[PDB]
Design a protein around this ligand. Structure first.
Ligand code: NA
Ligand code: NA
Length: 132
């Protein structure tokens, strides 16, 4: 009955978190069936506890992602600041507890996410391993 995104949302809800930020391309593909290596660019899947998800990708990937996902996809061209684009595109960025994949995120991306999101980050990686 439960989809993989349903399982993420159940986990968030159990742990009083409004949002998971999924960054590992392997996890994005696992959860959604969209397979993308962003290389050095930004990709994040935003799995809200009680809203539809959104995927943020380089602009080049928006058409393909949109063709295989049934929730909103948005992106950025290289002349745009991706942190500003995320902030402008997401309605909700004040979430007290946010889950993210600490084994995947580098400190640079973590610092970027911290410029967008007001809240405390917790580690999603153990749950992702448990799912698989
Ligand atoms: Na779509
Ligand atoms: Na912050």
């Amino acid at each position: 009955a439960m989809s993989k995104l349903d399982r993420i949302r159940h986990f968030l809800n159990e742990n009083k978190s409004g949002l998971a930020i999924v960054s590992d391309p392997v996890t994005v593909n696992y959860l959604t069936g969209f397979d993308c290596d962003p290389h050095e660019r930004q990709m994040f899947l935003f799995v809200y506890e009680n809203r539809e998800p959104a995927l943020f990708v380089p602009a080049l990937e928006v058409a393909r992602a949109s063709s295989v996902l049934d929730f909103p996809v948005f992106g950025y061209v290289d002349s745009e600041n991706p942190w500003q684009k995320i902030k402008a595109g997401l309605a909700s960025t004040d979430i007290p507890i946010i889950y993210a994949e600490f084994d995947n995120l580098n400190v640079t991306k973590f610092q970027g996410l911290q410029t967008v999101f007001e809240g405390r980050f917790e580690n999603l990686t153990p749950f992702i391993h448990k799912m698989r």
